[PDB]
């Protein structure tokens, strides 16, 4: 039956909030579990603004080293409207409180800006569990895959690459504000049961899958991945003379995606072209 993500346990949440285990170690949070509804609403709001920028809050809880997100609600926008709409979190009947904020970067990669990192610093300083989601609408529309942006920042006065596609303009902002935040591994959870049963509506499409036009839809994504892998491997070599394991994993995922696209193309060719010859 698995599940067990739901059934918000108030006592455990209060205990983990009062313990404050992330104050001692800065790299406490490493895994971000976004829900299906969270992603659906986030991407819908991100694309419902086109090239304009949208932002809202996302509700969830904390379990050990993972931060689970169950819901997300948009915002009207800096004026009194946003503050008035914030009361929705405590006005409705829901036990998930609030865990962070999401905001879109329409065509500017997935990194965190200077104002973004400053707001995240403030939010972490006075609201201990907080994460920032920096999803990109244009990239997921063009490439057909969703890129995630869980980018929790570091504390002030403390000292301790993936979507590097910004050609000219905002790459300067990327370089200066790069060590001020660390990415979180995004691992999606499906509630199973009802949603797993109802996911048959994806099977209803059956045409975008049969004609996917892969390997050209996200050609720029693969070229960027290879470009990142090149200096990842160069850094692994410099250290060697485990970054090599990470470079090997990245190469394996990129190659697996390429071979999956080729397999889809071969299946389509066998299904359609090799009939009535």
């Amino acid at each position: 039956s698995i599940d067990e993500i739901y059934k918000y346990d108030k006592k455990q949440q209060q205990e983990i909030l009062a313990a404050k285990p992330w104050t001692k170690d800065h790299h406490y949070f490493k895994y971000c579990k976004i829900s299906a509804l969270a992603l659906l609403k986030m991407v819908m709001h991100a694309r419902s603004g086109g090239n304009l920028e949208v932002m809202g809050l996302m509700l969830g809880k904390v379990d050990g080293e993972t931060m689970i997100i169950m819901d997300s609600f948009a915002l009207p926008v800096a004026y009194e409207y946003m503050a008035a709409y914030i009361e929705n979190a405590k006005q409705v009947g829901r036990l998930e409180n609030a865990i962070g904020w999401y905001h879109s970067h329409p065509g500017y990669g997935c990194w965190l800006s200077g104002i973004d990192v400053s707001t995240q610093m403030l939010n972490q300083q006075f609201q201990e569990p907080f994460v920032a989601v920096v999803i990109d609408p244009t990239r997921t529309i063009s490439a057909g895959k969703v890129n995630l942006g869980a980018f929790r920042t570091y504390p002030k006065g403390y000292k301790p690459s993936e979507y590097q596609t910004i050609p000219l303009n905002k790459i300067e902002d990327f370089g200066v504000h790069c060590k001020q935040y660390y990415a979180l591994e995004v691992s999606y959870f499906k509630s199973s049961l009802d949603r797993k049963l109802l996911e048959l509506l994806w099977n209803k499409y059956w045409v975008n899958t049969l004609s996917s036009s892969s390997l050209l839809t996200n050609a720029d994504y693969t070229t960027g991945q290879v470009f990142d892998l090149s200096e990842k491997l160069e850094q692994s070599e410099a250290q060697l003379g485990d970054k090599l394991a990470k470079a090997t994993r990245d190469s394996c995922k990129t190659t697996i995606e390429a071979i999956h696209g080729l397999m889809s193309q071969v299946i389509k060719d066998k299904l359609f072209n090799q009939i009535n010859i």
């Binding site: 819908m44 829901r94 509630s191 009802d194 949603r195 996911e199 994806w202 999956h260 299904l271 009535n276």
Partner: protein, 275 residues
Amino acid sequence: GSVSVALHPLVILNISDHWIRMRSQEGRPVQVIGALIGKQEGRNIEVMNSFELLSHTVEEKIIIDKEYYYTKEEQFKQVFKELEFLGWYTTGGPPDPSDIHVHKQVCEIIESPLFLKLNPMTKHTDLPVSVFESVIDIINGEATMLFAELTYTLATEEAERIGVDHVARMTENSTVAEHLIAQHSAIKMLHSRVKLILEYVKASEAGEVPFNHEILREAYALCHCLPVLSTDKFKTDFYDQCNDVGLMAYLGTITKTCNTMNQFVNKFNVLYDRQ
């Protein structure tokens, strides 16, 4: 379209999450009530994002707690400029008299209310059919209105399509199998459609069904279109793509071999030459 009802896949996920959250919170499954909004263009439904509208479910009666919905109206109007109340949703099987009472309460707010009855306990292949809305039948005496089911459509936008694809099985069970099961399902449903078309053609040939001169003409056109792009330029492009993917696989099999060789020499340097 004959009845112009278009549901969005986000509404179904909203109802499912609502039902699951309430079931986990209260231990047992519990009936839920909602409020579908959307855009009306005279003869169009176009349901979109739905909100809670908890109301009350006390004993056997549903009380009019619609003041909370009234407060939620201006709240959702701030983020949805072009969206208006259209109906309400529920979780259960066939319609019940309680559903009739709640629908009567809802008609006070809006003139054309819908009634979605997403069934989560279903155990049959095709999806639960959304909304059983009615034009309200009136007879002499008591109104005794019923619901006259009309068809629905699953029109979806691009962002919704990408999100649904991501939630669906896509990339313990290996990535090859997860990638291939989607193709297997798509090809299976295409094969079922083509097989049923072939069965209709055979039935028309034998004589079970009347001879429709246009269905077989469309079938002949479909058969004639079957060899898609069989050009020499298509073959050249396909072979170029295959060679590119082969090179991209070679670069990466080399990387994996280098990684394993590095591990081997690391283990070898601490076993034989202790320096």
